[PDB]
Write a protein that binds this ligand. Structure first.
Ligand SMILES: *C(=O)CCCCCCCCCCCCCCC
Lengths: 179, 193, 210, 221, 146, 184
């Protein structure tokens, strides 16, 4: 049950913080900017903490591929068909923060090649490896939806807050399907 | 409270020990996660101001690199549309490092970034070591605004910060227009059989 | 250089000259070459057009007028080769047809034509429920339950949709029916992206038809 | 003329044909008013259609009698004399005649010429008169204004001595004249674009400056 | 000889051309040459009269107007573009128009006009200045007219 | 399948399609009204179309790479292959070829066999030597490649509308700027 989705534009800074919990509203808008910027900084820290053993020898370019789930999304815009993608896809952030485990929630992070960051907080604590695949598939779902309804928007400056009407309701429906 | 139309990223960079932490004591919402400077490298402050009838949120990143932050400090200028170079008029080393800081900003920060110069601890006229004329002349060649700030001389940095945000908003603001007798009654079908 | 040259006037074209200066626009046919492209390219061209139009305009009315002018020319072009091109009955295709399509000259024949073939050609599906408000004198309207070009535009305001309004206006204007075409949003029926193109004819057309 | 849109129809050839017939009949009867009236239209609107022969014959036949008997007292179009640049030149060395000089913060870098003259110095007035038509006409005299006149008006004696200024057929031929300055101005930046001209011995008519395309060429003295 | 013109809604010609028979390469001798635009202007009124009338085809009107041994045929496109031809005898005859040939000629010339109109830079008011258009129109006249 | 059948499958059944005559008519209307606005200064029209294409490409780099999610191109060959074999395929029904490889593998040309933008086009006689009609594509390529930290220069050298038979777009990589976020 993904209870909160937030996205960081390219350089830190928050542009979308719609949450789907029943009623908590504990964190004001101001603190969530600090949370997102801290996440970006911690991502940067995590990039430069690889162990010495793996820096000179990776030999692991077979596990980066994400297996695809059939219908994780729902049950479209520029896309067409029963789903946004049927094929398996590859990981981009092979040297960055990927999730955060906690006994009360689990945070997943999916970084676009360009730099867009999509963060999903789920109340559910899966073998702690399949859930990565579920989260990556769902977040690429959300990224495709964003590329549809936020990028093809004349009244939207780049890397600024996403004040739109179709995008938020469609991601709300998408997360409602996934539970 | 997601009402702000624009989110500008500003970096408060300067020499260690200059007194940046006291410099951003005013333009803040003094709450939220305090410290965290030594943990990741930055502390965060925010300001809200209206310009041309449009709410603007400005996020201030007061980065500093002591011994550990080589690549991360560079990465923290990924999209900063503003900079607030700081030096103290007590020791010439801080003013000398301004060219090095500006070189890093213009090399790594966002293209055509609006960057300014702040002279902190100007109340202490006893140990002055950098004149206003030289600082202004250095600002002229590099397209920067320049000011001097002090605890007794407060409320100047606030005006300079608002003026910097206004300068930014006149550069990264796409022009827009305020987009804001329909038929009524029972219709009758007219589609062909 | 013997092309009309209207200042001089008509020229003597002796009927013994077959010398042919290929043009690359007259030789090419226009039959119906299917080259369907992605909706994404159309959407991005559309939104960049509107973005460029924001800086040039000053008010909402000027924005709508300039967008309608943009679509007007597309209407000018589309009228001819949607009326003409439908006359083909299953090199030049002029000598493939025995009978030109009967050009419409009535109040509702053109609106049926737009409902049927123009909208299908534009958006690959016939438009929905062409109706008229039969109260005042004349309020004819074309309603689409889910417009294609402006589906990505957020908000409840209809200002970016005047492009197809201009297309329709140019179509009827060349066809011999001046109009006051304008769009409105009428969310009804569970779609809620429902747009109605109210069409208002001039007194001249009303006098001509009766 | 009412049937067409001489003053719904944009067939220029037919319009000029009927207008030619109108002037021909208007001369057939002794009606010297409408000959001028319609020749004014025929060499203001349909000027880019009558070639050398038609314009030359029409100017010889219907225009010059229409001027000698004072039937029309205004020039055809206002699109004459595109540039009116004025200059002064230092006769002696540059040192000779100088124009007198006329006796904590927050810095940010984020935010046509005017001519000056003395009483005694001599100036140079140059204007680029144009002749869009295929015939030749002659300018008789040139004057500046009523307001900025009495200050720096062109020497009447000089233009009178120089005689009429003939303009070639399709030229932008220029006229260079002297100029005399008599009165001061203290501190009042006046403007100069009135520039009365007489063409083919007509009343002095105003002509405002028009550049290459509608923008006005204005200068201050 | 033949005199052909394409006229827009504002009653202005966007194209004009005259054809001959190649044994008398002079066109209309001197007087009908001056009178052609006026008679075509007159016939445009009848063409506009037939533009909105019920009673098959309605784009090709055939012989609509008559003058001193001159047959006048009109064809109307979908954008109100009027295609008008004036047929003249060979200095003595009663001119009879070939229905199928004139129909096909107007069809192909309408093809030319529509594919001229399609390009971005053309405007309805502007005239059809193009050597290719004139060349293909005149070889078309050879093909279909006579 | 490397890239051919991949892009073929995506265009076959992944994307909602629209008629291209509408696309070329729209682009023609923009270009014509732009030339009217700018008073026949076709160099400025080229600059404006370049800016428009740059904005479009900066926005477009998400649509591609969200539908495809191909890995980062390594060096100057996979990028050309993808860009000419599926990037154009997904958005348009065209599969341009690669030609004129430079001696040191730094420049390549996109021979555009079909140009849907210039479908019904015939330039005015006073612009056959100045106006690059489909200048939006160069801006799109420039911005789109810059957004993946692959800054380069893109320009026309010949067009079918102007003179020579073949139309080609030369793409020359200046440098791979290393501001490409903490990955890899
Ligand atoms: C390797 O670095 C990946 C390269 C990504 C190539 C992206 C190219 C997308 C744009 C293609 C042109 C489409 C034209 C659309 C016209 C509106």
């Amino acid at each position: 049950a993904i209870e909160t989705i937030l996205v960081i534009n390219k350089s830190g800074g928050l542009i979308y913080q719609r949450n789907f919990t029943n009623d908590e509203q504990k964190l004001n808008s101001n603190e969530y900017l600090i949370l997102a910027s801290t996440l970006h900084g911690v991502f940067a820290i995590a990039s430069q903490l690889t162990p010495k053993a793996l820096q000179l020898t990776q030999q692991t370019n077979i596990e980066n591929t994400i297996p695809y789930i059939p219908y994780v999304g729902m049950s479209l815009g520029s896309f067409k068909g029963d789903d946004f993608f049927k094929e398996p896809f590859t990981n981009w952030n092979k040297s960055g923060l990927r999730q955060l485990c906690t006994d009360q929630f689990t945070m997943f992070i999916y970084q676009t090649l360009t730099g867009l960051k999509f963060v999903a907080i789920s109340s559910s604590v899966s073998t702690s490896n399949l859930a990565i695949q579920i989260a990556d598939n769902f977040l690429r779902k959300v990224y495709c939806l964003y590329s549809d309804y936020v990028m093809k928007d004349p009244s939207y400056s780049m890397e600024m807050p996403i004040r739109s009407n179709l995008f938020d309701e469609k991601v709300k429906k998408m997360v409602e399907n996934l539970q | 409270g997601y009402d702000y139309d624009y989110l500008f990223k500003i970096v408060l960079i300067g020499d260690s020990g200059v007194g940046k932490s006291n410099l951003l004591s005013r333009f803040t919402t003094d709450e939220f996660n305090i410290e965290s400077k030594s943990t990741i490298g930055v502390e965060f402050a925010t300001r809200t101001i209206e310009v041309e009838n449009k709410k603007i949120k400005a996020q201030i990143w007061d980065t500093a690199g002591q011994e550990r932050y080589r690549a991360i400090t560079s990465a923290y200028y990924r999209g900063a549309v503003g900079a607030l170079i700081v030096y103290d008029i007590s020791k010439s080393s801080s003013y000398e490092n301004c060219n090095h800081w500006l070189t890093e900003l213009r090399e790594n920060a966002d293209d055509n970034v609006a960057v300014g110069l702040i002279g902190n601890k100007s109340d202490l006229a006893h140990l002055r070591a950098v004149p206003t004329d030289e600082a202004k002349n250095f600002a002229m060649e590099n397209q920067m605004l320049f000011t001097e700030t002090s605890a007794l001389n407060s409320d100047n940095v606030d005006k300079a910060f608002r003026e910097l945000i206004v300068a930014i908003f006149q550069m990264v603001s796409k022009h827009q227009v305020d987009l804001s007798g329909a038929p009524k009654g029972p219709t009758i079908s007219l589609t062909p059989a | 250089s013997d092309g009309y040259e209207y200042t001089v006037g008509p020229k003597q074209a002796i009927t013994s000259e077959a010398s042919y200066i290929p043009s690359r626009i007259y030789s090419e046919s226009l039959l119906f070459k299917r080259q369907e492209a992605s909706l994404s390219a159309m959407a991005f061209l559309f939104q960049e057009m509107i973005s460029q139009l924001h800086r040039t305009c000053k008010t909402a009315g000027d924005f709508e007028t300039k967008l309608s002018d943009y679509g007007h020319n597309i209407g000018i072009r589309l009228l001819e080769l949607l009326n003409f091109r439908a006359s083909v009955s299953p090199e030049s295709l002029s000598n493939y047809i025995t009978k030109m399509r009967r050009r419409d000259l009535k109040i509702l024949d053109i609106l049926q034509f737009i409902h049927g073939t123009l909208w299908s050609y534009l958006f690959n599906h016939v438009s929905d429920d062409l109706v008229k408000s039969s109260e005042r004198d004349n309020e004819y309207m074309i309603v689409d339950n889910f417009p294609t070009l402006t589906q990505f535009i957020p908000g409840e305001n209809v200002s970016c949709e005047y492009f197809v309004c201009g297309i329709i206006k140019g179509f009827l204007f060349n066809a011999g029916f001046p109009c006051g075409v304008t769009a409105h949003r009428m969310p009804q029926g569970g779609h809620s992206q429902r747009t109605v193109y109210l069409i208002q004819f001039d007194r001249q057309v009303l006098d001509r038809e009766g | 003329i009412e049937l067409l849109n001489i003053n719904q129809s944009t067939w220029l050839i037919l319009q000029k044909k009927i207008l030619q017939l109108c002037i021909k009949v208007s001369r057939k009867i002794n009606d010297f008013e409408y000959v001028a009236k319609f020749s004014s239209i025929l060499i203001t609107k349909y000027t880019h259609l009558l070639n050398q022969s038609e314009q030359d014959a029409l100017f010889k036949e219907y225009i010059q009698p229409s001027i000698t008997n004072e039937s029309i007292t205004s020039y055809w179009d206002p699109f004459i004399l595109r540039e009116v640049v004025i200059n002064r030149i230092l006769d002696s060395d540059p040192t000779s005649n100088e124009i007198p000089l006329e006796s904590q913060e927050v810095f940010n870098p984020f935010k046509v010429p005017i001519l000056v003259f003395l009483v005694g110095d001599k100036a140079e007035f140059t204007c680029r008169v144009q002749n869009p038509f295929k015939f030749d006409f002659t300018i008789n005299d040139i004057q500046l204004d009523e307001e900025i006149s009495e200050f720096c008006e062109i020497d009447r004696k000089a233009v009178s001595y120089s005689g009429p200024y003939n303009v070639k057929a399709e030229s932008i031929r220029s006229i260079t004249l002297p100029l005399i300055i008599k009165k001061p101005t203290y501190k009042k930046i006046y403007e100069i674009s009135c520039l009365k001209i007489s063409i083919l011995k007509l009343p002095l008519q105003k002509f405002d400056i028009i550049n290459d395309s509608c923008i006005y060429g204005k200068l201050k003295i | 000889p033949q005199y052909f013109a394409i006229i827009g809604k504002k009653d202005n010609p966007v194209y004009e051309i005259e054809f001959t028979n190649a044994e008398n390469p002079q066109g209309f001798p001197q007087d009908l040459k001056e009178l052609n635009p006026f008679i075509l202007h007159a016939s445009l009124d009848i063409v506009e009269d037939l533009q909105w009338q019920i009673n098959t085809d309605n784009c090709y009107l055939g012989k609509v107007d008559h003058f001193y041994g001159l047959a006048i045929t009109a064809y109307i496109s979908y954008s109100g573009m009027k295609f008008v031809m004036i047929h003249g005898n060979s200095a003595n005859s009663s001119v009879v128009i070939d229905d199928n040939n004139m129909r096909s000629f107007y069809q192909e010339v309408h093809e030319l006009y529509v594919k001229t109109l399609m390009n971005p830079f053309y405007k309805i008011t502007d005239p059809i200045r193009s050597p290719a258009f004139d060349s293909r129109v005149r070889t078309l006249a050879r093909k279909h007219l006579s | 399948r490397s890239l051919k059948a991949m892009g073929e499958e995506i265009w076959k059944n992944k994307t909602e399609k629209i008629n291209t005559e509408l696309f070329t008519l729209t682009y023609g209307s923009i270009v014509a009204q732009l030339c009217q606005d700018y008073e026949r200064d076709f160099n400025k029209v080229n600059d404006h179309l370049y800016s428009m294409g740059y904005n479009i490409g900066c926005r477009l780099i998400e649509d591609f790479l969200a539908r495809t999610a191909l890995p980062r191109c390594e060096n100057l060959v996979k990028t050309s292959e993808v860009l000419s074999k599926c990037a154009f395929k997904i958005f348009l029904n065209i599969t341009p070829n690669i030609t004129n490889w430079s001696h040191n593998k730094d420049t390549f040309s996109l021979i555009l066999d079909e140009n849907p933008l210039a479908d019904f086009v015939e330039l005015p006689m006073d612009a056959m030597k100045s106006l690059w009609y489909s200048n939006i594509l160069c801006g799109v390529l420039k911005g789109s490649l810059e957004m993946v930290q692959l800054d380069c220069d893109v320009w026309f050298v010949s067009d079918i509308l102007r003179g020579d038979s073949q139309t080609e777009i030369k793409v020359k990589l200046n440098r791979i700027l290393k501001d490409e976020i903490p990955i890899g």
